[PDB]
Amino acid sequence: SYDYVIKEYLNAIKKGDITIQQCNGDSLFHEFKNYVNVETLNNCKKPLVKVKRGDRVYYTYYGIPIANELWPFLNSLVRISNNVVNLDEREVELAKQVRGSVKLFVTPDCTKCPITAEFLYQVSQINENVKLEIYDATEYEEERDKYRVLSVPKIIFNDKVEIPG
């Protein structure tokens, strides 16, 4: 069960103002409500969760961040709520240069996906000019195919599908 880990990560950050907007993942997020503000959106055909602090949207995860995506997801909540980033100074400077849409496709059965999500969650913290969206490719199959995604993790920048040659 996820109750203990959710408490261990979120009980402290209770003093912050992290806000999660979600839909179709009620049974998971009902527990988060014990620690952070949770808004449940209406009329969703597929699940999603948006992470905000005030009016700022840090990212939207299309699917439900469970299995190996839960740890990075909880970590991002704590980092955002405490306004801390762990990327080194060079990565930070470099990350601040990016602009526009950044879409990361993942699936649960994916070893390198959590590593990439964690890295991008931190980039979304450092750079408000980036619009980060994460997609569970098994759930959002149309999006996966639109961007010609086969293996994951796969990052798409500025909605551009890069095709060799």
Domain total in the chain = 1
- Residue 35's Cα: distance from chain center in Å? 18
Experimental structure resolution, Å: 1.8
Q: Are strands 48-53 and 100-106 parallel, antiparallel or unpaired?
A: unpaired
* Cross-sheet strand order for the sheet of 100-106: 37-40, 18-23, 48-53, 56-62, 130-136, 100-106, 154-157
What would the 3-class secondary structure string for the chain be? CCHHHHHHHHCHHHHCCEEEEEECCHHHHHHHCCCCEEEECCCCCCCEEEEEECCEEEEEEECCCCHHHHHHHHHHHHHHHHCCCCCCHHHHHHHCCCCEEEEEEECCCCCCHHHHHHHHHHHHHHCCCEEEEEEECCCCHHHHHHCCCCCCCEEEECCCCCCCC
Give the method used.
X-ray
Query: CATH number for the domain including 104?
Result: 3.40.30.80
